[PDB]
Amino acid sequence: MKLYNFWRSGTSHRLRIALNLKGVPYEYLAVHLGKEEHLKDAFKALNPQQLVPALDTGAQVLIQSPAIIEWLEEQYPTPALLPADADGRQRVRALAAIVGCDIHPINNRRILEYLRKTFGADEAAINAWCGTWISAGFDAYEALLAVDPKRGRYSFGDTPTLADCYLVPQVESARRFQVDLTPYPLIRAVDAACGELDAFRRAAPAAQPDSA
Amino acid sequence: MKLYNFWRSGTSHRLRIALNLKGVPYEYLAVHLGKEEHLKDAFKALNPQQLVPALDTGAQVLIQSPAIIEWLEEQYPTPALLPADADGRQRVRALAAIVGCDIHPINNRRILEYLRKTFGADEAAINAWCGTWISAGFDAYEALLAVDPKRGRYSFGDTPTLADCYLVPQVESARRFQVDLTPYPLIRAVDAACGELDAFRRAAPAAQPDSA
Ligand SMILES: N[C@@H](CCC(=O)N[C@@H](CS)C(=O)NCC(=O)O)C(=O)O
Ligand SMILES: N[C@@H](CCC(=O)N[C@@H](CS)C(=O)NCC(=O)O)C(=O)O
């Protein structure tokens, strides 16, 4: 297994947590987004979409972190990252999708570049943009954590799930874009509890080979 | 079941197709996005995130169309919208995630409103934005359809899948934003094949009760 990814990438960080929780070994292959190595014909051979991450399983190159992570859950049952019952699965998947659909893609490099080059945005306007979508997404996420009475230390129950895999990288991203997280005690408690776990610690951007 | 949705909403349309394919009956409850009925406290009681669609199952209100659809596939097995094998699953999920993560959310109403109100974007700039992310996502989607040797009429195999549930609304949106689809014959052929099916036809925005 070869993971084509980038240290500060939220989607890379997402897949790293899932892989580490499953204890699946993989070779770390850095694809430097700042250098735009993903925008080159060489990387297009691996991923036509030209985004990270991409996972070479040995037999094939897989794309889309959400699809890869669902794949890992089935290919590597232990520990389970999705609950067994329909209602629980739907809720974990919804919490994940708040991050995966409604926060992360909006703050992606290509988007911020568009805002800079087409809309003349300076860095303060970039940070105001990222904070808008994060705050909106975290508002909804936090509200959902509040109403779940059976919830323990993490997003759902008292074991780490897919939802935590999506949430942790997003909280890190929020801190990079200087998003004030005071209004989200519950998300911050989930993030800190996750931060105690080896799988999460090893996956963090600063622990990566290509870190600054 | 009650479906809180909007006729031209791409995610609403996505969910409608899945519900129609599963032959599951629901009450159509319109939530007018142009009137911003979703931004009112009344809708926040149903969905704290304040987006459409939301599905009241009688017993609970479900949010996040990707999660709801994965829920329907488990709850209502026939006809199968995900293949049986892991590699097939992952690939259908990846195609859906290109649309669900990397196209649709970028062109959402709230985002375009932000471009208008913060960056002073006019409609031509709005259309140039929307086409940028659609063309980028469709480039990758189309490339994947081309490299699948055993593909029939649809995105994967020769039965409709979740991927088609995501693709068709996106193609409709592409047409609303005047995106030139000449470069995507394979996507256009998948869409035309889907448009032959009762389930898709009934789900089309123009066929909805709150349509113009
Ligand atoms: N849905 C994709 C999203 C991939 C994605 O957007 N990756 C970002 C890194 S977090 C990227 O490659 N950005 C490069 C760019 O914006 O040019 C996935 O989760 O795999
Ligand atoms: N990930 C969500 C996305 C929902 C979403 O963004 N819905 C749009 C309609 S396609 C919406 O409600 N937009 C209202 C707005 O932008 O203010 C889902 O699939 O349920």
From Swiss-Prot, chains A, B:
Its cofactor is glutathione. Residues 85-212 form the GST C-terminal domain. Residues 1-80 form the GST N-terminal domain. One of its GO terms (cellular component) is cytoplasm. PROSITE patterns: GST_CTER, GST_NTER. The keyword Translocase does not apply. Glutathione binds at residues 9-11, 38, 52, 64-65, 102-104, 108-110, 176. It catalyses: 3-maleylpyruvate = 3-fumarylpyruvate. One of its GO terms (molecular function) is glutathione transferase activity. Keywords: Aromatic hydrocarbons catabolism, Isomerase, Plasmid, Pyruvate. One of its GO terms (biological process) is naphthalene catabolic process. Pathway: Aromatic compound metabolism; naphthalene degradation. The keyword Kinase does not apply. Its EC number is 5.2.1.4. Catalyzes the GSH-dependent isomerization of maleylpyruvate to fumarylpyruvate which is subsequently processed by NagK to form pyruvate and fumarate. NCBIfam families: maiA. Homodimer. Belongs to the GST superfamily. Zeta family. This is Maleylpyruvate isomerase. It comes from Ralstonia sp. The lineage of its organism: Bacteria, Pseudomonadati, Pseudomonadota, Betaproteobacteria, Burkholderiales.
